[PDB]
Structures are given as structure tokens and as C-alpha cells.
Design a protein around this ligand. Structure first.
Ligand SMILES: COc1cc2c(cc1OC)CC(NC(=O)c1nc([C@@H]3CCCN3C(=O)CSc3ccccc3Cl)[nH]c(=O)c1O)C2
Ligand SMILES: COc1cc2c(cc1OC)CC(NC(=O)c1nc([C@@H]3CCCN3C(=O)CSc3ccccc3Cl)[nH]c(=O)c1O)C2
Ligand SMILES: COc1cc2c(cc1OC)CC(NC(=O)c1nc([C@@H]3CCCN3C(=O)CSc3ccccc3Cl)[nH]c(=O)c1O)C2
Ligand SMILES: COc1cc2c(cc1OC)CC(NC(=O)c1nc([C@@H]3CCCN3C(=O)CSc3ccccc3Cl)[nH]c(=O)c1O)C2
Ligand SMILES: [Mn+2]
Ligand SMILES: [Mn+2]
Ligand SMILES: [Mn+2]
Ligand SMILES: [Mn+2]
Ligand SMILES: [Mn+2]
Ligand SMILES: [Mn+2]
Ligand SMILES: [Mn+2]
Ligand SMILES: [Mn+2]
Lengths: 180, 180, 180, 180
């Protein structure tokens, strides 16, 4: 295939993220050289999840995303049987040891409301906290409890807008936005 | 011998822990290839002690476990003659510079009460603080003063339950539980 | 050319700073072997900017100086469109996520008042915060809000006076002061 | 010469400390293979100074000891001309940016009172703060303002008593104590 978007992803995101995203796609029968926009979205979602877990204190967050499915669910079981929290029907992205709730992190190229709705009706599980970021700088969170302080969220939003500009400078943005 | 439990231990715990546990067993005339459940228990107890000492601040805890016997007692003497605390009759696991007391950490596959009792009657030394963790997520501590905040304890309990699941996924758990 | 000041700069500042300063000069058609005092000033300004951003918390400051022009402006756009702050007419040195303002850092061998005035009339942009340091230990900041606590500023001033003494011990100071 | 005390020093203290102590002795025309007790005392004083500066916050302390004489005085000049503090007649060990005073750290095998007196009458300079530690666990400080919190001081005292026991276990202590 040899797309521009594939080479941009490997040059824009750090190698641990790119490697984790490649594994994730191949685990579900997808190819980063063909599904290159999905490749870019998964790297972005990964980097946001990691920046998020760095926003708290040392021990605050348990990272669920970026693990293989079986180990991710194993950590979820341990957390649930240790804290008595309901076992979510779907894999969340993090666990907040301070607020004692699982977090599902969303990154969308749409209006946060339109994504939150879809991400909440399908969420079904009432317990898990939801937190959406947008490539335009909007964010929406359950009960408007945004977990982290403003500074850590602001850095996530700045990084997201930088990724947008880099894609636009290479004319890859419009194809990326129109392929959600 | 070549047991499954031995290979699981080396693949589940990090090499510094495995090495420290091997030394500890050989110092007391035990073989990790034969006493493989004891091998697993010592690695677990070691990892819990290290996670515990990381839960406090930078200078809070002095680590006693994981040293050879003579150096461990040497540090105890220095702590005692520096803080005036009673020299314990038995080797503790940590010293809390903030609360000024030695800590004995227990990890059991039984009810925390049954282990605490045995670990307290044999403790004899009235001064040292006791803190028990279980593979099911229960904890018991002297005066119910659990030293660390909830988040740091919760991580220890999550790790303990992950070790349990990994053993069970390999059918090693029932032999591990029935060999205390 | 082979000047003493060039060899002093490479021996006094750390290699990442020296390399960043060399790139910056060559990007604007200047040579560090000829414009050696400018070479020294840019390394100094760079080290001060980096020490400054280290004075805050983990996530407080976004570093703008030390990047190439296009990426520096890209980060500025992301910050502006994320926080709604006015896009400055000129490239600032940092962004404070806590106080939500861009910072322009000045390092002068003159009176802070004389430099602040020139650095403020040409600043034009009313929004960006200004913070001047001197090689004698004086500092001046917008509204006399010096952003960081005293200890972090004191370290910057101590380093600046050490650079002065080292230049004077090599008789390079008077040429450095008289070439602003 | 090949003394036991020399081999104990190299095996007990870390290589950066041993190297810094060797330079310090040779700068003043002393040999670590002959003045082996002085060798041990300088390594001890160095390790205490470094542990002390680690007890505060990130930016709190400027380290003066362990530098060559000319650079140590250069940092002192910068600190003095930056904070307006009196230039001490003698080289101190640290500068506290939080309390804005130089610290002279003492490590003695005598009574802290007997050492403090001698270390204060010869200090002459009224401004610099004095802080003495003993190999028995006593400490004395100017105005009984001990700068650091109890935990950080307790660790210094524990290390000092460990060095004592190690020397005694090798029958080197009595020669060390009787050679102040
Ligand atoms: C391929 O089918 C599935 C895969 C997975 C799950 C469920 C799946 O369906 C049965 C759970 C887990 N999904 C997430 O972790 C997750 N998913 C999303 C969005 C909306 C929901 C589906 N989705 C995808 O992207 C699916 S594709 C994909 C996802 C992750 C890695 C690689 C690929 Cl290829 N958004 C997130 O913010 C988020 O964290 C992995
Ligand atoms: C082999 O005899 C002894 C060995 C040791 C001590 C005393 C011993 O008896 C004379 C002190 C010290 N023990 C502990 O540090 C410690 N011990 C335990 C449990 C209950 C009490 C005995 N025990 C064991 O596991 C003994 S075997 C063993 C222990 C540690 C490493 C390697 C091996 Cl092989 N539980 C802990 O939580 C704990 O910290 C080492
Ligand atoms: C070469 O022209 C220009 C270059 C640049 C800018 C603007 C320029 O004019 C069109 C923006 C940016 N300047 C700064 O970031 C900056 N500049 C200064 C001082 C007063 C204003 C001009 N200046 C210089 O030093 C110019 S030369 C120079 C500067 C930086 C690196 C290398 C060189 Cl060679 N003082 C700072 O504290 C400070 O942060 C780069
Ligand atoms: C060799 O002459 C001198 C050397 C030096 C100074 C002054 C000297 O006299 C002219 C300043 C500086 N001294 C200290 O920094 C310092 N000195 C001491 C004790 C009591 C005062 C003298 N002293 C020594 O140990 C001297 S020998 C020595 C010292 C340090 C390294 C190597 C050697 Cl060989 N105690 C400390 O706690 C302390 O910090 C270096
Ligand atoms: Mn996910
Ligand atoms: Mn997600
Ligand atoms: Mn123990
Ligand atoms: Mn124990
Ligand atoms: Mn600049
Ligand atoms: Mn500047
Ligand atoms: Mn000294
Ligand atoms: Mn001293």
C-alpha cells in the first residue's frame, strides 16, 4: 500500500505507541498499512490514555488499554474483587483508585455531545465513568466531573490540536475527519 | 525437578525479586526447584514489601526484608540506637520513619484473622506493627492503623489477586493454597 | 576564527543547549564561530528558559523556545485554540498552563528597567507576560507577578552570576557586556 | 601501605564519594593510603552532606562541598551577590535557598557539644548555620533549628551508626574514634 498516512503515523507517534497500536489492530484482524486512518486513531487514543494516567498522582490510575484482551480482563477482575466495584460489560481504559471507578476515554472528530451519546447508550454499564476529548479542544465527562485538574486536561487538548495541524499540513486531515 | 510452578514464578515475578528469593531460600537450606510453592510465596511477600515501601513518601520507609541476615540486623541496631525503639526479638520487614515503628508484613492464603492471631502470638514483641494482606483482598493491621492511604493498599491487593488468577489459569492455585 | 569565547561556551554549557543554540543561529544566517557573544547569549537564554520551566510543577509549563520556528508556532496555535488565548504577534518562550498566559523571558546585561521598556514597547501584544533576568541578580516581571517561587528564581540568578564570573576570569566579560 | 581501613572505605562508600574524597585529600597534600582514617571521615562527611541536600525539596539546597576550591567559592560569590547574604570567611557545605543561609555540617566521634563549641568559636562568621551529627545518634543545630524534618535527619543518623558497626565488626572503630 505505502500510504502517506502510515508514514506520518510512524513519524509522529513514539515507537512504543506505534507498536502497541499495531498489535491491537492485528489482534482484531486489521492491517495498519490498509486501515491507516484507524491506525492513526488508535495511536492517538493510546497517547491520550497514557497522558491521562500521568495526570494524577503516582498510584492513582491503573491502565487497562494497551494490554492484550486476556490480561486486561484479568486486571479488571482483580480490581473488581478487590474494591467490590461492578464488573463492566465492556473493556474500560483506566481505573481510578482515588475515585474508585473505571474510566472510558473517547477521542472523536465529531461534536462531543454526539459522541458522548453514542458512547453512553452503548456503554449500558451505569458505573463506569466516561470522558471524551475532541480534536477541536472540547471535552465532556460524566456529571461534568473531569477527574484531573485543568492543566493536565489542557495538555491533552494541546497535543490533540497539534496532531490535527500536522495532518492538515500534509492534506491528510480531511480524509481522517471524514472516515470516522 | 522441572515443575510448572517454578517456570511460572520466573515468568511472573521480576528478576531482582526472583534472585533475592532464591538467595533467601538457599541461605536457609531450601531449594526453589523443590520447594516451589515456598518459592512462589517468598517472591510474593518480597513484591508486597517493596510495593508497600513505595507507598509512602521518599524517605518514609527503611526496608529490612530482602537483605542478608547480618546486614538486616545491623540496620535494625542502627535504627534502634538512633530512635530509641525496642530491639525486636524477630526480624521485621520495614521501619516507618514517620510513625517510628517496625512493620511485619504478612501475606496469607487464609483468613486474615487466623493468620494475624498466629502472627501476633508468635510476634511476642509488643512494639512492632503488624499488617496482613490476603490473596482474596482482605487486610488487617494493628489497631486498624493501616499506615498507607487506601490507593497504595488497593494496588497491593489488586496485584495479589492477579497472581491468584494466573496460578488458577495454570491449575497451580489449589496446590498453592493447600500448601501453607 | 577560533575565539576563546567559542571554546568557553562549549565548555561551560551542556551539549544539548550548545547544539540547540547552534541550530538557532544557523537558521537565521549567523555563525557561532564569528558571532561568539551572540552564541554565548543564546545558550544563556536557553538555559534560563529551561531552568524556568523546571521551577513549576510537572505539567505547568509548555516550552516554546528551542524548537524550530514552524513547530513553535504550531504549538502556539494549539495552545491558543485550546485555551482561547490571543495569538501573540511574536514568538514567546513558554506557556503557563496554570496562569494561562504566554511568557517572554529576557536576559540582559543592562538595567532591567531599560530592557523591560524596550522588551515591552516592541512586545505590543498586551496579553503575554514578561519576565526579565539580569547578570547582576535583578529581575522585573509584569505586574511584579514573578510566576515562580523565590527559590526557583534564586537558582536562575545564581547561575547567571556564575556565568559572569567565569567570563570575567577569562577577560571575556567586558567584551560580552559591551556587545549587547 | 595497604591498610584494612582503606579497603573497607572503598567497599563501604560508593565510587563517586570515594573519588571525590580522594581528590579532596590530594588537593591538600594528603594520601588516602596513609591517612586512611581521614579518608574514612571525608567519605562519611561527603555522604552526609549529600543525604542532607536530598532531604529538602527539589530546588532547596545548593551543594558547596565536593567541588574544587575555586568553583566552590565562585558559587558562594554568586549566591552572596544574588541574595545579599554576608560572604562567609570560611567555605560552608551547603546553601539553603528556602531559609537563605549557608550551612556548615559537622560529623564527629565526640560529644556534639564539644564539637559544636570548637566548630562555632572557629566559625567566627555569625551568619552561617551550623548542624552537627554524631556517630552515636546525637545532633545539635544553631538555635535548635534543624532545617530538615525528623525523617530525613533520622536516615542520616541510621547511616552513621551503620558505618560505626561495620568499622567495629572489623576492629577498625577504636582506631577511628581515637584519631580525631
Ligand atoms: C474489534 O472489535 C472490538 C475491539 C475492542 C473492543 C470491542 C470490540 O468489538 C467487539 C473492546 C476494545 N475497544 C476499546 O478499547 C475502544 N474501542 C473504541 C471503539 C468504539 C467501540 C469499538 N471501538 C473500536 O475502535 C473497535 S476496533 C479496535 C479497537 C481497539 C483496538 C484495535 C481495534 Cl482494531 N473506542 C475506545 O475508546 C476504546 O477504548 C477492543
Ligand atoms: C528458616 O527459618 C527462618 C527464616 C527467617 C526467620 C526466622 C526463621 O526461623 C528460625 C526470620 C525471617 N523471616 C521472615 O522475614 C518472614 N518469615 C515468615 C514466615 C513465618 C515465620 C517464619 N517464616 C518463614 O517463611 C520461614 S522460611 C523463610 C523465610 C524467609 C526467607 C526464606 C525462607 Cl526459606 N513470614 C514473613 O512475613 C516474614 O517476613 C527469615
Ligand atoms: C533573527 O531575527 C529573529 C529571530 C527570532 C525572532 C524574531 C526575529 O526577528 C525577525 C523570534 C525569536 N526570538 C526569540 O525567541 C528571542 N529574541 C530575543 C531578541 C530580541 C528580539 C530579537 N532577538 C534576537 O536575539 C534575534 S537573533 C536570534 C534570536 C533567537 C535565536 C537565534 C537568533 Cl540569531 N530575545 C529573546 O528573549 C527571545 O526569546 C527568533
Ligand atoms: C587542609 O586545610 C583545609 C582544607 C579545607 C578548608 C580549610 C582548611 O584549612 C586551611 C575548608 C574546607 N574544609 C571543609 O570543608 C571542612 N573541614 C572540616 C575540618 C575542620 C576544619 C578543617 N577540617 C579539615 O578536615 C581540614 S583537612 C580536609 C578538609 C576537607 C577535605 C580534605 C581535607 Cl584533607 N570539617 C568540615 O565539616 C568541613 O566541611 C577544605
Ligand atoms: Mn479501550
Ligand atoms: Mn477508549
Ligand atoms: Mn521478613
Ligand atoms: Mn513478613
Ligand atoms: Mn524566544
Ligand atoms: Mn526570550
Ligand atoms: Mn566543607
Ligand atoms: Mn562540614
Amino acid at each position: 500500500r505505502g500510504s502517506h498516512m502510515e508514514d506520518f503515523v510512524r513519524q509522529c507517534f513514539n515507537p512504543m505507541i506505534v507498536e502497541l497500536a499495531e498489535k491491537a489492530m492485528k489482534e482484531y484482524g486489521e492491517d495498519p498499512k490498509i486501515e491507516t486512518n484507524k491506525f492513526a486513531a488508535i495511536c492517538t487514543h493510546l497517547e491520550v490514555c497514557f497522558m491521562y494516567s500521568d495526570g494524577g498522582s503516582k498510584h492513582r490510575f491503573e491502565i487497562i488499554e494497551g494490554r492484550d484482551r486476556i490480561m486486561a480482563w484479568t486486571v479488571v477482575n482483580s480490581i473488581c474483587n478487590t474494591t467490590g466495584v461492578e464488573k463492566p460489560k465492556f473493556l474500560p481504559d483506566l481505573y481510578d483508585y482515588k475515585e474508585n471507578r473505571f474510566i472510558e476515554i473517547g477521542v472523536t472528530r465529531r461534536e462531543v455531545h454526539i459522541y458522548y451519546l453514542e458512547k453512553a447508550n452503548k456503554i449500558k454499564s451505569e458505573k463506569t465513568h466516561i470522558h471524551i476529548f475532541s480534536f477541536t479542544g472540547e471535552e465532556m465527562a460524566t456529571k461534568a466531573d473531569y477527574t484531573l485538574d485543568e492543566e493536565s486536561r489542557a495538555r491533552i487538548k494541546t497535543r490533540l490540536f497539534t496532531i490535527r495541524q500536522e495532518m492538515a499540513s500534509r492534506s491528510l486531515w480531511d480524509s481522517f475527519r471524514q472516515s470516522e
